[PDB]
Amino acid sequence: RGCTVWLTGLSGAGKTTVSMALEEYLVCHGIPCYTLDGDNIRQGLNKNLGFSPEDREENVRRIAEVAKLFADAGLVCITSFISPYTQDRNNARQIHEGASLPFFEVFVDAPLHVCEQRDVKGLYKKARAGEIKGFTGIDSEYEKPEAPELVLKTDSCDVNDCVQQVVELLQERDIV
Amino acid sequence: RGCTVWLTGLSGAGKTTVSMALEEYLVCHGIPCYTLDGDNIRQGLNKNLGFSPEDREENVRRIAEVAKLFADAGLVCITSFISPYTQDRNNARQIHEGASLPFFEVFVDAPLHVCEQRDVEYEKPEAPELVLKTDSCDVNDCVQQVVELLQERDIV
Ligand SMILES: Nc1ncnc2c1ncn2[C@@H]1O[C@H](COP(=O)(O)OS(=O)(=O)O)[C@@H](O)[C@H]1O
Ligand SMILES: Nc1ncnc2c1ncn2[C@H]1C[C@H](O)[C@@H](COP(=O)(O)OP(=O)(O)O)O1
Numbered sequence A: 001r002g003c004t005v006w007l008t009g010l011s012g013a014g015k016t017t018v019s020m021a022l023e024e025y026l027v028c029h030g031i032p033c034y035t036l037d038g039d040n041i042r043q044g045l046n047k048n049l050g051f052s053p054e055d056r057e058e059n060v061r062r063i064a065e066v067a068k069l070f071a072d073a074g075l076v077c078i079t080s081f082i083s084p085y086t087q088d089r090n091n092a093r094q095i096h097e098g099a100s101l102p103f104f105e106v107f108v109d110a111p112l113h114v115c116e117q118r119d120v121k122g123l124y125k126k127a128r129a130g131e132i133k134g135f136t137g138i139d140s141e142y143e144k145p146e147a148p149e150l151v152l153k154t155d156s157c158d159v160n161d162c163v164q165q166v167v168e169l170l171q172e173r174d175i176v
Numbered sequence B: 001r002g003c004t005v006w007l008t009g010l011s012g013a014g015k016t017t018v019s020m021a022l023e024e025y026l027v028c029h030g031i032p033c034y035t036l037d038g039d040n041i042r043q044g045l046n047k048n049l050g051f052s053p054e055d056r057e058e059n060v061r062r063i064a065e066v067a068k069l070f071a072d073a074g075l076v077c078i079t080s081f082i083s084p085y086t087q088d089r090n091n092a093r094q095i096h097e098g099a100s101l102p103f104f105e106v107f108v109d110a111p112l113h114v115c116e117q118r119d120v121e122y123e124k125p126e127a128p129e130l131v132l133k134t135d136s137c138d139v140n141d142c143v144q145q146v147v148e149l150l151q152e153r154d155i156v
């Protein structure tokens, strides 16, 4: 019963935080899983990709292919990437659909204002000052999911509420 | 914990056969494992890569980076490609060893003569962790050789 839990959302909306708490819950309940994120991807397989529209397109494509393999192998694969473009997220869904694997698009949704008040790594302030260019939500677009399987309201639910909602979806869809 | 079993050898030497047999043995002993081969890599992750030297180097680099994720995830990852160039296998190796993830270069070794008599350029591994003489060992014997290797380094 492998599947891919595809997170998407602005920088600082809560993707890393949710993925890690979701991965902890699953391991403790004896469900194999693995998380793909900036740390293990953008410095390994995707070390040769930047942040131009084309390189974010290829970033997501390779991640989709990789996730599909983990899902195929029997793991719950959590991906934790901004994935700002609808086309690429829809392509990632297609990849899993073609291979008959369950794909759950989870919109991790905190408003831009909350993300920048959180400013977890000081990035929004730099982006605003033009010291970083093409930052998502300031200088390049984030296209919100039109029909995700789940929307996580990370400004109104705490981390554990969010994890429980994802687990709920996984139960209803017969993964766990 | 996890590791990469990196098969290398001529066409018809026995990589597909060994990997299928090894994966079967591991799974029925409750050990997680997944195989990367042309069937799940070539038209997916590496579909935007052609036949040029630069693309073949990038082909191997990506496979090695995906295998490392499976090892890190805790699976025995078996890769099954001809993998002809020493520079490329060393690259794959360094990707793993730099993260302290166990990496086994396994030479699937049958003479060219036999490989053609099978009918289902290459640079021979310099110091591979294991040689499988597939002309003189049967499939099950080759599997036990790999499993014995895995048992030594606390993988299996
Ligand atoms: N130009 C940028 N836009 C958005 N995030 C960036 C940028 N440069 C570096 N980062 C950062 O890289 C992370 C986002 O990387 P990804 O999630 O891999 O983005 S994606 O758009 O290609 O999906 C952010 O947490 C972050 O701090
Ligand atoms: N319900 C929730 N889910 C996730 N994070 C939350 C949250 N409520 C508050 N936070 C906080 C914790 C983190 O400091 C911050 C999110 O940062 P993050 O998970 O690193 O973001 P991202 O990975 O999307 O860039 O917001």
Ligand SMILES: Nc1ncnc2c1ncn2[C@H]1C[C@H](O)[C@@H](COP(=O)(O)OP(=O)(O)O)O1
Residues within 6 Å of the ligand: B009, B010, B011, B012, B013, B014, B015, B016, B017, B018, B108, B118, B120, B133, B134, B135, B137, B138, B139, B140, B142
């Ligand atoms: N010990 C052994 N290991 C692997 N294959 C063996 C073998 N002894 C005989 N064979 C036969 C079985 C297959 O028909 C053939 C191997 O072909 P294959 O596994 O498709 O090669 P490759 O994947 O290396 O191209 O050789």
